[PDB]
Amino acid sequence: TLVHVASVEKGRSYEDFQKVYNAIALKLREDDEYDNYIGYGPVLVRLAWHTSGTWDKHDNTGGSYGGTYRFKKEFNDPSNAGLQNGFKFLEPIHKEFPWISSGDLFSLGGVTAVQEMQGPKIPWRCGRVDTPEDTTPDNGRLPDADKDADYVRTFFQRLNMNDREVVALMGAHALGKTHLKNSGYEGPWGAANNVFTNEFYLNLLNEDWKLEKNDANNEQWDSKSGYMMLPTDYSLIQDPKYLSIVKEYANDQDKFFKDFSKAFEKLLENGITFPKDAPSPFIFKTLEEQGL
Numbered sequence: 001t002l003v004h005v006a007s008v009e010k011g012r013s014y015e016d017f018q019k020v021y022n023a024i025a026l027k028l029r030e031d032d033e034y035d036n037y038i039g040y041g042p043v044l045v046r047l048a049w050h051t052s053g054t055w056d057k058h059d060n061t062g063g064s065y066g067g068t069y070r071f072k073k074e075f076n077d078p079s080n081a082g083l084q085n086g087f088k089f090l091e092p093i094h095k096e097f098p099w100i101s102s103g104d105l106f107s108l109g110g111v112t113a114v115q116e117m118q119g120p121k122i123p124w125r126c127g128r129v130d131t132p133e134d135t136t137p138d139n140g141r142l143p144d145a146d147k148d149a150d151y152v153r154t155f156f157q158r159l160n161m162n163d164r165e166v167v168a169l170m171g172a173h174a175l176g177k178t179h180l181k182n183s184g185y186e187g188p189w190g191a192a193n194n195v196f197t198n199e200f201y202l203n204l205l206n207e208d209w210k211l212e213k214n215d216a217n218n219e220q221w222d223s224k225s226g227y228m229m230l231p232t233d234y235s236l237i238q239d240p241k242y243l244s245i246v247k248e249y250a251n252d253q254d255k256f257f258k259d260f261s262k263a264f265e266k267l268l269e270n271g272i273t274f275p276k277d278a279p280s281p282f283i284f285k286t287l288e289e290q291g292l
């Protein structure tokens, strides 16, 4: 096989997408009360990841291209509980810029959130095209959180990610929090949960973790500081190959930034064929860099 060729929204170029980025960024700044003043940054990053994370490299089903989260089957995946907040955030952006495809909007939301939260630049390509309801992938392609390193490693092979790519991507769990009503887990992973840093890896290594049960009767790792880790997070320190990489990112902020950028762009582009004469990837300026 199934091929998805990137097709640029007619006549559009860099400055068009910078305007969309800016609208997303200005709204992130303005709607700062959401989720007890965490803001919408983290949930927009998660929306970008879940809308891309359904891809299967074996038959090119799912993926970011089609923007299929807009259809009820995907919108209602239990794995996607909570993401409706990110979709509602993006509705007035799409209303203002109706020419942008849904896949481009969901993925750009994630890029914008990362950069506006002071994370690395994430180069971004346009040209995802909406596909019909019957191309929506079935529920069950996003990962379980109660499993071990072997499960994590095997799961991400389906997304064509290796050990380094997996450990880098998981650093996005510095952001936001788990919410009991959404996923059956509760609590933030760190203190700095709307600013993008390598705090996830520092916390895995330096906090004193206790294996406890939360109020939904699921096990999670808790610290005295009020932080939590999922079993799938904690697995990155139980598997000695993951552990080496975790230590690497805990000791090099720049390296984590560069590896995360690459891995997250790749996650967002999986499944898409870019014609040889497609535009180069766009690197958007932050509001702060524009003096806006």
Ligand code: HEM
Residues within 6 Å of the ligand: 042, 043, 045, 046, 049, 081, 082, 143, 144, 145, 146, 152, 169, 170, 172, 173, 175, 176, 177, 178, 179, 180, 182, 183, 184, 185, 230, 232, 264
């Ligand atoms: C084994 C892989 C993963 C598992 C099991 C997993 C699981 C979870 C769970 C259970 C939550 C809490 C959802 C809620 O209760 O609201 C969550 C939140 C989140 N995840 Fe993942 N995740 C994984 C990988 C990733 C990746 C690759 C990214 C992005 C690169 C990511 C980004 C986030 C973000 C930003 C949140 C916070 C959302 C918010 O605060 O609303 N996760 N994850």
